[PDB]
Design a protein around this nucleic acid. Sequence first.
DNA 1: CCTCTGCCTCAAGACGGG
DNA 2: GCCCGTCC
DNA 3: ACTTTGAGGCAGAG
Length: 290
Amino acid sequence: GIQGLAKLIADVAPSAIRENDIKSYFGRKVAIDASMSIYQFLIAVRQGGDVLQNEEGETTSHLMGMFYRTIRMMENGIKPVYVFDGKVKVTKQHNDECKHLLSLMGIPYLDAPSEAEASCAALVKAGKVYAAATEDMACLTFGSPVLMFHLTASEAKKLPIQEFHLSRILQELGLNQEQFVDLCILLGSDYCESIRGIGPKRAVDLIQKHKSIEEIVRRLDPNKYPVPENWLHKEAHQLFLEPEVLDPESVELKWSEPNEEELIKFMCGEKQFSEERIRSGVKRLSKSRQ
DNA sequence: CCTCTGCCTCAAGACGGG
DNA sequence: GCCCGTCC
DNA sequence: ACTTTGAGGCAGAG
Ligand SMILES: [K+]
């Protein structure tokens, strides 16, 4: 994500962070990064050193995680759309089996040209969902107006939901969106390096004073704060500001009734889940729809 | 103050019975 | 409520 | 990634 950004916001713009009750999200739609979440399931849902799996050794940890997490959100009246990345390893088989499961649950999903986080942001911008619920601060860096942070952790711990508001962030820092991108690069982004010596304090000052990365190097003393060689900040700046994304007007998001017999055939027949648990999950899914 | 860096420890996904 | 054992 | 791995606290040097 962005190295330090949540702590920085809590340190300098805490009013951009709202603590809200899970009950106030009832009826809201939220975009969720399927690629990221599959990966977390592959790491966490383990037994005796291995993922869960059927008799033939096919992994089911991603399905276990995605089935019950999705039911849990719907039971809270939060209607999710999952976004799959575009251009422990998450395979194509993981993706396709999670997509199959979600159709069978009646849960929508979209495929993203490139970065799921950015395309999640594009759904928020366009008003197609209320927020992105992801664990990546870079959603804010991609321009997303609202980001629900640690939704599942808060749900389990019966804790209030941290909700980051990009507009209040810019207002407290005195920064436009373009200038906020450059800050996040200085903090440390996935795309390129950060200047050694320049931490969260020094980064905010220079951005507020000078307003752009290229300006910074000119005013910076090269001897004291040398930038790394062939620094790709220009390209990273371009990846955040104008990312390849899907069209949020393009696909209608619809939430359908779950296809129980096909879910039994697939989760129980093939993947060898317990039939009682799958029916019990479906029943809660039906009740959630109301 | 400000950034490193190194040394430490401590859940982690979800459900449900006890 | 909180532990833990178990899920496949 | 639980027979491990990252964050997050904390303290000390440049
Ligand atoms: K740095």
